[PDB]
Every structure is written in structure tokens, then in C-alpha cells.
Amino acid sequence: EQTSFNNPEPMTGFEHTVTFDFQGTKMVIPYGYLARYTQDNATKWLSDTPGQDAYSINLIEISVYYKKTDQGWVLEPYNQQNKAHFIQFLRDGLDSVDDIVIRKDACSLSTTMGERLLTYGVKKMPSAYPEYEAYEDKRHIPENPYFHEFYYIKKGENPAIITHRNNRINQTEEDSYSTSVGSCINGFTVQYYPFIREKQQLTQQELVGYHQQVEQLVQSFVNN
């Protein structure tokens, strides 16, 4: 199948969609979520190619700008208001834009991850969400006094594990948190490092809030 880059730069992110075929599953993505697939200083954007069915692929990476509001963090495609952040991200990666990796694949998250955390001495914590179980590990380790990890596990039909962790190793450094999310959403595995430019510790509400938008977004692509 032939590739083309014949869509102009977005103002809303919703001007065009690109249609993908994942082993027979149709995904229809608003092109503003596809910042990685542009040419000429992001003036040419990936497009559907007439004559061809749909890009037949195994995986796609969407990109979202994350923004503080008074109702919380929201995720946005490329638009005229946030464009400078995406352009900085495309230039060197140093802006508040995250990559979400979507693959059509069997879910490989076990239902026994929580058991394994507890088996290793991670502590079970009360959770702000009924659908999540929450875990924390802040053991004193002699050669790393800054160790701190959180885990949030969603089960049911669309499981997820969220790991938020302090990366600081030296006394001379500031605390530096980072997050990984592995999940399964309606036949896709969806893996990402959210809040990529955030060094500060995040609450369960900020993490789960982010992921809830990721699910809704991914489900919007297949729903049509």
C-alpha cells in the first residue's frame, strides 16, 4: 500500500482522519493525534491515500499534549492553540507531549500482578477508585534512601498497570518521578510513559484521570 503526506497542518486536529487496518480491525484516527507522521517542519501530515484500502499495520503511535485545567489534566491533539508545544516535541522531545503506543495484540497482563507485588513486600493501599487496586513501596533500602514506587492495577475487561517511581539515586539530586502504563483496551495493547516532563510526584487521581482519557480516546477510534 502507498503512503502519502497530503494533509495540511491542523488548526483543531479534527480536520481529517486517517484510517488504519489492524488485522481486519478498522481504526479511524483524527490526524491531529498523529504528530509523529509529518514532513517538512510539520507542514505535511499523513493522509489517507485514494486507491488503497487503509494502512495495514501492527502498531501506531499517537501523540497527545497534556494540559493543566481547573477540572484537571486534559489531553489534546495538535491544534492552533497548542502547536508550539508539539513543534518543540517534534524538534527534540522536550515538551509536554506524550507518546501512546497502540498495537493489535493479545493481552499479556496477568490477573496475579497484585499477588506478586505483595509477595515481594509491596504494600497494599486504599484506592481512590473502586476499579483500581493500589500498591505502594517505600521500604528503607540502605544504598538507595530515595526509593519510592506506586502501583495501580485495573482489572476487568480492559486491564491496566500503572507504575510511578522515584528515579533519584544521589543525595545531590532532586526527586524525579516518572510513569509507565501498560494496558489492554478492546483487542489492543496500549503502552506509554505519561507526564513525560513532570518530575513531581503525582496522585492516583492524576494518573487514573490520564488513563481514563486514553481509554476513551482509543475506544473512540474503533467505535466510529
Residue numbers in the entry: 44 to 267
Question: What does the report in the manuscript say about this coordinate set?
Answer:
The FrpD43-271 protein (FrpD), a construct lacking the first 42 residues encompassing the N-terminal signal peptide (residues 1–24) and the linker sequence (residues 24–43), has been previously characterized. The protein crystallized in two alternative crystal forms, belonging to the hexagonal space group P64 and the orthorhombic space group P212121, both accommodating a single molecule in the asymmetric unit. The structure of native FrpD was determined at 2.3 Å resolution by molecular replacement using the SeMet FrpD structure and refined to an R value of 18.3% (Rfree of 24.9%). The refined crystallographic models of FrpD comprise 224 of the 229 residues, with one N-terminal and four C-terminal residues being disordered. Both FrpD structures are largely identical, with a coordinate root-mean-square deviation (rmsd) of 0.56 Å over the 224 aligned residues. The FrpD fold comprises three blocks of β sheets (I-III) flanked by helices. Block I is an antiparallel β sheet composed of the β1, β2 and β5 strands; block II contains two antiparallel β strands (β3 and β4); and block III is a nine-stranded antiparallel β sheet composed of the β6 to β14 strands. A single disulphide bond in a right-handed spiral conformation is present between the Cys150 and Cys227 residues. The electrostatic surface potential map revealed that the FrpD surface is highly negatively charged, except for a single positively charged region located at the β9 and β10 strands of the structure.
FrpD is a highly conserved lipoprotein located in the outer membrane of all meningococcal strains, and it does not exhibit similarity to known protein sequences from other organisms. Intriguingly, the FrpC1-414 fragment exhibits a very high affinity (KD ~ 0.2 nM) for FrpD, the other protein expressed from the iron-regulated frpDC operon. FrpD displays a compact, slightly concave bean-shaped structure and consists of fourteen β strands (β1–β14), one 310 helix (η1), two short α helices (α1, α2), and one long C-terminal helix α3. Hence, the similarity of FrpD fold topology to other proteins was not sufficient for establishment of structural homology, indicating that FrpD possesses a novel fold.
